[PDB]
Amino acid sequence: SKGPAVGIDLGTTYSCVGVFQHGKVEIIANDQGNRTTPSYVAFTDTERLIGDAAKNQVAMNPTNTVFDAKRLIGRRFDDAVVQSDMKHWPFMVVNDAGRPKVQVEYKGETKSFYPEEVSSMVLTKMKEIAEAYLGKTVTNAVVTVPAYFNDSQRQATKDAGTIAGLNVLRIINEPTAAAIAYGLDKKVGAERNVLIFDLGGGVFDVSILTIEDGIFEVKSTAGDTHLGGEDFDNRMVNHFIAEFKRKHKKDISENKRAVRRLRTACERAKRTLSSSTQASIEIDSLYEGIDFYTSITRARFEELNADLFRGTLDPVEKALRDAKLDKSQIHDIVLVGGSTRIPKIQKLLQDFFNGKELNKSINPDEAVAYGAAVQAAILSGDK
Ligand SMILES: Nc1ncnc2c1ncn2[C@@H]1O[C@H](COP(=O)(O)OP(=O)(O)O)[C@@H](O)[C@H]1O
Ligand SMILES: [Mg+2]
Secondary structure, three states, X not given: OOOOOEEEEOOXXXXXXXXXXXXXXXXXXXXXXXXXEEOOEEEOXXXXXEOHHHHOOOOOOOOOEEOOHHHHOOOOOOOHHHHHHHOOOOOXXXXXXXXXXXXXXXXXXXXXXXXXXHHHHHHHHHHHHHHHHHOOOOOEEEEEEOOOOOHHHHHHHHHHHHHOOOEEEEEEEHHHHHHHHHOOOOOOOOOEEEEEEEEOXXXXXXXXXXXXXXXXXXXXXXXXXXXXXXXXXXXXXXXHHHHHHHHHOOOOOOOHHHHHHHHHHHXXXXXXXXXXXXXXXXXXXXXXOEEEEEEEEHHHHHHHOHHHHHHOHHHHHHHHHHHOOOHXXXXXXXXXXXXXXXXXXXXXXXXXXXXXXXXXXXXXXXXXXXXXXXXXXXXXXXX
C-alpha cells in the first residue's frame, strides 16, 4: 500500500535508520532523541531492554547485557575468531550443535538465543522507531553488511530481518551505501576510485571501491577488527584511574561499577572534545563517597591516543598497495563511522592525502543508513 522502505545500518555498537521521502533522506531519531541507538540488548527479572535503555544499565547487569552480536552472527563455535573474542565478553556463549549461542538469565529462567535472534531484537527497535516517526507500518527494508561478510553471515543477517518482521529487499555492502549517500554512483563516463575510511565503536575498515558506468567493484579492503572508539575511551580511563589513585591514594581498578561509570563519562567527554578543547568529568560518589571532579584538554586527549590515531594510516597504505593505486589515483575520500569526527584523525588523513578534501557533510555515523535509505526507495520504486 504505502509503507515506505527504510535503510538500516545494523552496526557493531550502534545502529541507524533513515527514510527517503520527497527527494530527501531523513535519519530517524529515537524516543530518547538520539539519531543512532546502541546495538545492546539486556535481560532482567521483569523485562527485555533494547538500545539506550539496555546500555544505560550495563554496569549493573554485566552478565545479562548482550552486545557485539555482529561479531558472532554467521560463524561457528569452533571458529578461532569466536574463541578469541569470547575470552573478553561478560556474557556466556555456548555451543549448540556447532553453532555459537548466547546464554542469559531472563525472569529467573536460563535462556539462550542465536546471534540472529539478538540482532532481530535490535532491528525491531529500529523498525519501531521508524514506524513511530512515519506514523505508518514499515515492512520493506534494506540492511547493510561489511563487504567481507560471506554467504553465511549475510544469510544470518537476512534471517535476523525476517525474524523481526522485515521484508529485506536487498543486503548491500556498507562502503557501497556510503558512496551512494554522497552520490558517487552517478554515471560520469569515467572510472572512479573511492576510499571508504570507516572508524566506528570497535571496528576499523578501509576499502577501495572502483565505480565505473554505475557498477561498484571492491578493489581492496584493510583495517583492524579490534580498533575503534572504545579503545580511545579506555586510554582515558587508565589515565583517570591513575589520576584518582594519585590524588586520593585509592586504586579503583577493582570496583567494576566505578570503572564502567568512569568509562561512560569518558565516552561523553570524548564527544565534547570534537567541538570543544576542554571537557568536564563530573562523577558523584565514584569510589566510596569520593566525588571525582576533573577535566581534560583535547591536547591531552590526543596525547593519550597518539600511537593509536597514527597507526590508522598503516591499513590505508596497505589498501592502496593491494589495489595497486597511488595516493593520487584516488578520486574521493568518504568518512564513515562516529570516530571519524575526531579533528586529529581528520588532519592526519588529509595530511596523508597531501591536502585532498574529505567528504564529510553527512554525519559519518549516519552515512551508511543514509545510503541504504536512498537504495531502499529505488528498489521500492519511489525514486
Ligand atoms: N563526536 C564524536 N567524537 C568521537 N567519537 C564519536 C563521536 N560521536 C560518536 N563517536 C564514537 O563513534 C563510535 C560509534 O560509531 P558508530 O559508527 O556509530 O558505531 P558502529 O559502527 O561501531 O556500530 C563510538 O565510539 C562513539 O563514541
Ligand atoms: Mg558505523
